[PDB]
């Protein structure tokens, strides 16, 4: 009976880790977009 709860808790932990990784990826994404914008800003 506790096996299902263990699996559910593992699911929640995996979701939290996934959310953290997604957030850091989005941060890198914003950094790259801003850097590209700055680089293209000087060209014209």
């Amino acid at each position: 009976s506790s096996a299902r709860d263990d699996k559910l808790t593992a699911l929640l932990a995996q979701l939290d880790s996934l959310t953290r990784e997604l957030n850091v990826v989005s941060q890198q994404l914003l950094d790259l977009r801003q850097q590209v914008s700055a680089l293209k800003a000087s060209s014209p």
């Binding site: 989005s26 941060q27 914003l30 801003q34």
Partner: protein, 50 residues
């Protein structure tokens, strides 16, 4: 109320309690005690105006 957009801000830095120095040098560290530390420009509450 208004808070800092942790995503859209350019230089957002999640600062914990153990590293907010505002009113430094004139308030105890993490507890009401004698004044501790030196005076310094602060680093915490993020301006939401101005």
């Amino acid at each position: 109320r208004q808070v800092v957009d942790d995503t859209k801000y350019k230089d957002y830095q999640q600062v914990g309690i153990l590293h907010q120095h505002n009113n430094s040098g004139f308030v105890g560290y993490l507890a009401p005690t004698m004044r501790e530390g030196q005076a310094y420009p602060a680093n915490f509450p993020y301006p939401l105006i101005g």
